[PDB]
Amino acid sequence: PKHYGKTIKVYEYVPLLDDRNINDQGIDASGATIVNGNLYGSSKDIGNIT
Amino acid sequence: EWNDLMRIEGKAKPPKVKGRSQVQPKLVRRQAEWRYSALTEPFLGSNKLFK
């Protein structure tokens, strides 16, 4: 529609377990504050997942 | 343009300001809203349509 200028914007939602998902909400099993909110990113390492 | 006046879109829309309202009451829609139901009913008053 008119009078909105000349721009259109859309929103894209990334999954839960992607490396692009970066947030400040994370608590690890102990209860402390952890850096990353993803359980694990786009990492398939068996050692890293466990 | 006439449809945009009816639905409040395009040029009929009020400008957007941060500290002020954008409420536009709908006049053309109202005037048409009585006319519709006034006109439709005669064609649905009986079971048969054509004489």
Rounded CA separation A26/A35 (Å): 6
Q: Which two tokens stand for residue B25?
A: 């009451």
Resolution of this structure in Å: 4.0
Rounded CA separation B4/A3 (Å): 13
User: Which residues does residue A27 pair with via DSSP β-bridges, in sequence order?
Assistant: A33
Distance from CA of B1 to the nearest CA of A (A): 12
Q: Does B13 touch chain A (CB under 8 A)?
A: yes
Which residue of chain A is at minimal alpha-carbon distance from B14? A3
Phi/psi region, residue A35 (left: phi>0; alpha: psi -120 to 50; beta: rest), is: alpha
Q: Which two tokens stand for residue A17?
A: 């377990």
Q: Does B35 touch chain A (CB under 8 A)?
A: no
* Experimental method of this PDB entry: cryo-EM
Rounded CA separation A18/A42 (Å): 5
Q: Which two tokens stand for residue A18?
A: 């992607």
